[PDB]
Write a protein that binds this DNA or RNA. Structure first.
Ligand SMILES: Nc1ccn([C@@H]2O[C@H](COP(=O)(O)OP(=O)(O)OP(=O)(O)O)[C@@H](O)[C@H]2O)c(=O)n1
Ligand SMILES: [Mg+2]
Ligand SMILES: [Mg+2]
Ligand SMILES: [Zn+2]
Length: 463
RNA sequence: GGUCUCUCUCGU
RNA sequence: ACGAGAGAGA
């Protein structure tokens, strides 16, 4: 992904889009009970913690583009993946605006506690002014779309969140693209049934884990990924996608049976326009993370990428013995023989991809179930029932969340949520966690889940 | 101050 | 089941 041009809003006639500059993350009453090295991300250009030009760091993720048209390996990869999806029988028909706005049993409705994007953001109008859950009316929406049309520019914000201090110093905060409600509901109408199918079949057939529950999915992963494992993260995944991969995505969508009208929207994703403060800018390539179906499309492109790198990098690869699941750019995959991920990365850099170990560490090493991670969680077999697998969130990542808050009114909700992650690390680590919470006044006022009840509730999930 | 998924909590 | 809120993950 590379920025093509940057004109002021005056020259493009776009309305300015004003974004918050102050973090909502105050330190919590547990801020000094637990060690930790994450701080709220840099959001103002004058953040004293900066050591690099701010706006230059945010946009440094647009590495640039390499390929524009698919080669032989990427075509073969795309078709292999697409024939895999055929067995799901995606209904490619247009979804109706009622279900697209208000949801179905396998696709939650448009979030009305969040913005409506350009231009509504600047016009003061909110999503709840167009859609009501109770009537499930679409007339108010059908009207507005007719009036502003589609291909509406994305609104660029910086994300308020705890980040590494390396990334605070180097100004590498995350950019999100606020979709226009019009673009969002049109994508849902075009691809609603594919979203539905993906959410309802996490696993190695979608090659996706969107919709999975780690508490139960982890026990299946060793069965869905037999053989020797490998695993990746990508550095700057969304911006690092050259337009070739969107062409390759069109190949997949055609081959599962979408109309020439439907695949035409892919170019609207490969080629996007964004407002940030008082400027407009055009991005070619790169996924606009914040669009409808971000996770699902990131995951599908990843299935294409991995396949394409294997058959290009190694002779004698057989893509039918490959199992993988992707959640966005997180990969966990397996193959009957060991795969030298160092070579897949060399290939990726040729396509403009920066592949890294899952942990984002400096060297690749062998990956097996005892050191694997997916969605930050490890794999730890139960002591009594070794075929059940605990998703283990590391205690350090739990300690970092508990040290901050966006509203102390929710302290108990927060700690409870964290306890439900923590106890998979076992009774000793868990009770060390709970004793720490109890070592401060507010902690002794909180209801904390009892370990055995958590373990009993977990074991009941398999009945 | 986006798209999603998952889990929890509070309400007839 | 339906509404309200939270946390985590991508
Ligand atoms: N809050 C987030 C985080 C992730 N993503 C999507 O998931 C992708 C990968 O997630 P992640 O690895 O966390 O971010 P990266 O872009 O790869 O940056 P990094 O180098 O830090 O891994 C992103 O590119 C983005 O498209 C998202 O939409 N919203
Ligand atoms: Mg990444
Ligand atoms: Mg990732
Ligand atoms: Zn353009």
């Amino acid at each position: 992904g590379e920025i093509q041009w940057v004109k002021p809003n005056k020259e493009t006639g776009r309305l300015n889009i004003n974004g918050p500059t102050r973090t909502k993350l105050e330190p919590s009453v547990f801020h000094d009970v637990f060690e930790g090295n994450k701080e709220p991300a840099v959001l103002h250009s004058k953040d004293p913690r900066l050591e690099v030009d701010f706006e230059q760091a945010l946009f440094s993720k647009y590495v640039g583009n390499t390929l524009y048209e698919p080669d032989e390996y990427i075509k073969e990869a795309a078709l292999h993946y697409a024939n895999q999806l055929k067995q799901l029988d995606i209904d490619t028909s247009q979804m109706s605006m009622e279900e697209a706005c208000y949801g179905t049993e396998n696709l939650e409705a448009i979030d009305l506690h969040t913005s409506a994007g350009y231009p509504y953001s600047a016009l003061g109008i909110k999503k709840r002014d167009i859609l009501d859950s109770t009537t499930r009316d679409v007339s108010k929406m059908k009207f507005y779309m007719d009036k502003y049309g589609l291909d509406l520019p994305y609104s660029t914000y910086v994300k308020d969140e705890l980040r590494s201090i390396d990334k605070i110093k180097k100004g590498k905060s995350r950019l999100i693209e606020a979709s226009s409600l019009n673009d969002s509901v049109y994508l849902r109408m075009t691809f609603g049934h594919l979203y539905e199918t993906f959410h309802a079949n996490p696993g190695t057939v979608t090659g996706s884990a969107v919709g999975c529950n780690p508490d139960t999915f982890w026990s299946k992963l060793p069965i869905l990924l037999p053989g020797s494992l490998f695993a990746f993260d990508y550095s700057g995944y969304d911006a690092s996608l050259s337009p070739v991969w969107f062409r390759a995505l069109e190949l997949v969508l055609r081959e599962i049976g979408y109309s020439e009208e439907a695949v035409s929207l892919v170019e609207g994703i490969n080629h996007t326009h964004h407002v940030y403060r008082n400027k407009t800018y055009c991005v070619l390539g790169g996924m606009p993370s914040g669009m409808s179906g971000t996770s699902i499309f990131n995951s599908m492109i990843n299935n294409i990428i991995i396949r394409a790198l294997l058959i290009k990098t190694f002779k004698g690869i057989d893509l039918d013995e490959l199992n993988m699941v992707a959640y966005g750019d997180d990969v966990l995959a397996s193959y009957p023989f060991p795969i030298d991920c160092l070579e897949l990365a060399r290939t990726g850099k040729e396509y403009g991809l920066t592949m890294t170990p899952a942990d984002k560490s400096p060297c690749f090493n062998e990956v097996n179930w005892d050191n694997a991670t997916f969605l930050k969680r490890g794999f730890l077999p139960d002591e009594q029932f070794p075929f059940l697998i605990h998703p283990t969130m590391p205690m350090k990542e739990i300690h970092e969340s508990i040290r901050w808050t966006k509203d102390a009114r929710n302290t108990q909700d927060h700690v409870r949520s964290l306890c439900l992650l923590a106890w998979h690390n076992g009774k000793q680590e868990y009770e060390k966690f709970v004793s720490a919470i109890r070592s401060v006044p507010v902690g002794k006022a909180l209801a904390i889940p009892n370990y055995e009840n958590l373990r009993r509730n977990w074991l009941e999930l398999f009945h």
